[PDB]
């Protein structure tokens, strides 16, 4: 028996899911379909070693997930550049989703920037989980699949970047959330009134309160038998924070060890004084 | 069902009152001024407060030290409270130890907030009040080993939780199924699930006004863990300070 209040919350949930589908080309629904089973070109090419990687570049439409060179001795840096490029693209998608969140574009512009600066990576890790399973991660719009073991065997620094994400993913995936759930959750993440440097926290907390309300209802309707999923999901927010912290440290190592590499401008600004 | 929830809530509250001498209610009365505590706002006041209060060279160090003594006491109070939580004592013994080992820091800061305001913190059963600025004026990195707690506290206290709310929240923190090294995660999550349901009802019945307070409180978990990790890093760096054997053992 939908009430007048719960009615508006359902409308918000629908709106967000709609914008999510429109803003993110590769949904968890598609990722799962690729990862589990089918025959259509949905089957990804699997990269689990140097030779398969070499053939991957030939098979997979890596149209652009590689800078201007390839014979860069180590594949470690080629993967680095590719992952970097995808993140920038993800920031772009998340930024577009954000503008669809009711009230977000009406907030002070400096705060819009602050909210995006701190929320984008937490969102990136949340959604990256949709593309992972305990054995690897979908890449190049789902065309390829790079194994966890392969990524772990990379040169000293690089071989330590992905594991923490996989550990978070296997755990987060156990909540069995679908795209309709995630659309609201990522909205909640963005409208965080506790981000450093925010000018007007009040209007932001008001928007988040309504999102939380929407998320609460969504999880109870969509996952009836999942006791306290709402609270379990909210607690996952601490895991995302840690991933970021740790990630930043690994980045500082790369910056010093690899003088010939550099973070993309967008990413640099995001991490500056974080 | 909702019957067991309020019963659980009452039980936890009663137990919390028995285990924790200085309650938030108590502390607030003393803080807002409603037998004024001795105030330590500088060196001489501290030195005076010592021969007056009798708490139980290098001030910055003696202070940080005092923090430790109280922390150790707090762990015992927390441990006793833990045993009153339904299901806790029935858990694998090693798991009980793991949950306490990783949960006392989070609980310590959570309760520390009850005794703080943006200007200072109550010490020794509330007999004293040490200034935020005095603490913030200590040499070395000591002049900021408490500041992060004050910052958390100011933010945490905005939620206006009371002892009955905190009792259930603390129990939730203790029953965290994600602590490393746990042997049987299931019972732990099942108890926490129960505690979470009790905390939600408690917040809905105790604060009809505050929308999504449950969600907001759970979100503060992020701030506690971040403050704890940061507290650990500070403790290490401190080592670079070269200024008992049984003492070190106790702490
Ligand atoms: C979304 O999760 C990740 C994981 C790793 C990342 C990034 C993002 C970004 C982009 C960003 O952080 O904005 C960079 C630059 N990463 C690397 O350093 C890296 C190094 C070696 C390998 Cl094999 C793979 C990736
Ligand atoms: C929850 O576990 C703790 C840990 C540390 C604590 C307190 C409580 C309290 C609250 C209380 O003791 O009632 C205070 C004031 N703490 C201090 O930081 C401190 C610092 C220097 C000295 Cl000399 C004495 C105490
Ligand atoms: C890093 C993340 C980025 C998520 C937005 N990810 O798991 O996709 C990452 C790991 C692996 C790659 C990657 C993508 C595309 C191509 C390659 C390659 O080595 O050719 C690697 O990005």
């Amino acid at each position: 028996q939908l009430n007048p209040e719960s009615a508006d919350l359902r409308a918000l949930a629908k709106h967000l899911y709609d914008s999510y589908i429109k803003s993110f080309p590769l949904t968890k629904a598609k990722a799962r379909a690729i990862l589990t089973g089918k025959t259509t070109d949905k089957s990804p090419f699997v990269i689990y070693d140097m030779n398969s990687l070499m053939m991957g570049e030939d098979k997979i439409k890596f149209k652009h997930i590689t800078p201007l060179q390839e014979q860069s001795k180590e594949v470690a840096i080629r993967i680095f550049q590719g992952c970097q490029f995808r993140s920038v693209e993800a920031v772009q998608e998340i930024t577009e989703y954000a503008k669809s969140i009711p009230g977000f574009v009406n907030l002070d512009l400096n705060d819009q920037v602050t909210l995006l600066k701190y929320g984008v990576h937490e969102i990136i890790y949340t959604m990256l989980a949709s593309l992972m399973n305990k054995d690897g991660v979908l890449i190049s719009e789902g065309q390829g699949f790079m194994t966890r073991e392969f990524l772990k065997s990379l040169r000293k620094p690089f071989g330590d970047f992905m594991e923490p994400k996989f550990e978070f993913a296997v755990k987060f995936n156990a909540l069995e959330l679908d795209d309709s759930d995630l659309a609201i959750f990522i909205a909640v993440i963005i409208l965080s009134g506790d981000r450093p440097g925010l000018l007007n926290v009040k209007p932001i907390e008001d928007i988040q309160d309504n999102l939380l309300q929407a998320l609460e209802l969504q999880l109870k309707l969509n996952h009836p038998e999942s006791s306290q999923l709402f609270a379990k999901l909210l607690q996952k927010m601490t895991d995302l924070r840690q991933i970021v912290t740790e990630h930043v440290q690994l980045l500082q190592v790369i910056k010093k060890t690899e003088t010939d590499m550099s973070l993309h401008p967008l990413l640099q600004e995001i991490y500056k004084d974080l």
Side-chain angles (χ1 to χ4, degrees), chain A residues 4-274:
Chain A
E5 288 80 67
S6 65
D8 279 326
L9 295 175
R10 294 311 288 158
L12 179 56
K14 198 125 297 293
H15 167 73
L16 293 171
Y17 181 31
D18 180 66
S19 311
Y20 175 98
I21 298 301
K22 295 169 174 182
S23 310
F24 303 111
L26 179 60
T27 63
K28 179 171 179 176
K30 185 158 186 289
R32 289 300 120 189
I34 293 174
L35 291 170
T36 58
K38 273 272 64 173
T39 251
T40 166
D41 193 53
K42 285 179 161 296
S43 280
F45 176 77
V46 176
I47 300 171
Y48 62 89
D49 69 12
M50 251 56 88
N51 278 189
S52 56
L53 180 286
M54 260 64 242
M55 278 224 266
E57 300 200 61
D58 188 305
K59 312 292 185 178
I60 306 175
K61 186 181 182 183
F62 281 173
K63 188 48 193 173
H64 203 319
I65 318 177
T66 47
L68 197 150
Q69 303 304 175
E70 58 174 57
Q71 72 303 319
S72 181
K73 275 173 57 286
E74 52 191 0
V75 301
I77 289 188
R78 224 148 61 232
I79 299 174
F80 177 84
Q81 302 291 176
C83 194
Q84 198 170 70
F85 159 80
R86 174 47 190 151
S87 296
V88 174
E89 182 176 62
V91 165
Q92 300 173 63
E93 283 152 25
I94 292 167
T95 296
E96 180 170 1
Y97 179 66
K99 297 151 72 177
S100 81
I101 302 171
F104 182 84
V105 296
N106 303 295
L107 297 169
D108 174 288
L109 191 45
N110 300 89
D111 286 353
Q112 290 184 208
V113 170
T114 295
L115 290 180
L116 284 172
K117 176 188 177 65
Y118 290 92
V120 75
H121 281 90
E122 290 175 7
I123 290 173
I124 284 175
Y125 296 134
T126 294
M127 300 184 81
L128 178 58
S130 302
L131 309 188
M132 308 176 132
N133 57 31
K134 67 180 178 60
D135 302 315
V137 66
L138 286 178
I139 63 174
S140 178
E141 314 176 299
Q143 290 176 286
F145 179 80
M146 196 165 278
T147 61
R148 183 179 182 173
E149 293 273 50
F150 181 53
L151 287 163
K152 211 299 176 184
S153 65
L154 297 183
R155 180 154 73 65
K156 307 175 183 181
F158 310 81
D160 299 348
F161 273 78
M162 296 310 287
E163 265 307 293
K165 285 68 175 182
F166 279 113
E167 302 188 75
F168 165 75
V170 100
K171 200 72 178 301
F172 188 77
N173 289 342
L175 298 184
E176 312 200 296
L177 300 180
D178 58 30
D179 295 297
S180 61
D181 303 315
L182 293 165
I184 307 180
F185 177 55
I186 63 176
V188 166
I189 289 174
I190 300 182
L191 282 279
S192 296
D194 78 309
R195 302 302 195 187
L198 287 178
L199 301 184
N200 322 313
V201 174
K202 218 295 187 177
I204 292 171
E205 302 187 327
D206 288 345
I207 294 170
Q208 206 193 216
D209 180 300
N210 195 37
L211 288 171
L212 286 166
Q213 227 174 294
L215 175 58
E216 184 174 12
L217 184 51
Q218 173 62 34
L219 300 177
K220 181 44 62 184
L221 296 164
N222 201 34
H223 303 72
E225 278 61 76
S226 189
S227 194
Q228 294 293 130
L229 185 56
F230 181 54
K232 287 189 181 64
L233 177 52
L234 290 177
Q235 302 203 76
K236 290 296 181 176
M237 288 172 99
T238 87
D239 301 65
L240 294 177
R241 281 291 186 73
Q242 284 181 52
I243 304 298
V244 176
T245 302
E246 168 177 48
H247 189 75
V248 172
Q249 299 176 307
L250 297 173
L251 243 34
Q252 288 304 295
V253 178
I254 291 301
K255 180 178 183 175
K256 290 175 180 298
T257 176
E258 315 305 314
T259 56
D260 47 4
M261 282 203 291
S262 190
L263 244 304
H264 175 297
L266 213 193
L267 271 32
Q268 248 175 52
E269 193 48 53
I270 289 167
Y271 286 115
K272 186 180 175 186
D273 305 346
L274 197 62

